[PDB]
Amino acid sequence: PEMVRGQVFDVGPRYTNLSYIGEGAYGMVCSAYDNVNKVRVAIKKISPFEHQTYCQRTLREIKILLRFRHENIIGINDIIRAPTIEQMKDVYIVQDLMETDLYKLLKTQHLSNDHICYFLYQILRGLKYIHSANVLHRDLKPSNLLLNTTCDLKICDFGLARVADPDHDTRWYRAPEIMLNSKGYTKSIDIWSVGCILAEMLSNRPIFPGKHYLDQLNHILGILGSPSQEDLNCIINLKARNYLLSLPHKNKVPWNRLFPNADSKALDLLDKMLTFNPHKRIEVEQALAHPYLEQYYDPSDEPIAEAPFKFDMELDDLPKEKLKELIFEETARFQPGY
């Protein structure tokens, strides 16, 4: 087995010629040569078994990505783990290798309005599918948006993905309702993140680069202005609400002042996605039908999921040893002699 950044990547003999791509909370990503398909692939090594929360994330991502089938959503082509449950310490998820991500592209490249439009379209096309299956991503950011050599875009990293239930509920792309209204299962949280990504594509810099929770709220309020009484007359964390009420008045900054060169239709859609109140924020289908996306909007070519996604078990209640058995079972079909 090859060693990448001092750590073991036990993916041979099929996968070789490893090269580091990145790491984070998702684990470590390498590219490798697949000697069967005769192409380079992406391999993600995860070590989640010591924590129940990491076990839940691993299982959710495997189940969702193996069910989903959409051009703007990354799939899972293969999964490597040990022959026995006692020996299984790591899981390797094998996926299509892309050319870059939007984080790397935004650090080196200025995008034309046609490419901002096209990328925003593909993000929403993928999000329409996810939301149609009653699922929300919850962690949309530029490093989770993959691009190939021909500008085809794929959303990845479904570790924090959950089945939506809206009726009752860095940090740079996090909706205010996550930090205030204790919401984590409303599709609107993904729209806010897409709004943050759109703003970043327009200027090559994060719109709300908060260093911490309070600083994040100050950045949002610095553009949107003070929340209205209605924006605050909802379910909100007492500490958060008292903090907001203790602050001096902040004026709203018009979108054209922050992005003076942006297409006015792009700013109009940006205004609708970056709305403080989640109940007043534009939804995915309405965002696809906005005049900014007219050149690419094609409802006859925007697949939706066959049925809502559902977990057969209460994953949050299961001890990590039980989750490990379900992961072992879910990954059995990728092993020899199945």
Ligand SMILES: Fc1ccc(-c2[nH]nc3c2CN(c2ccccn2)CC3)cc1
């Ligand atoms: F410059 C790059 C070139 C290729 C990729 C790529 N291609 N295919 C994948 C990835 C990254 N990736 C990720 C990234 C963050 C979280 C989970 N998974 C796994 C799937 C990324 C950057």
Ligand code: NI
């Ligand atoms: Ni409720």
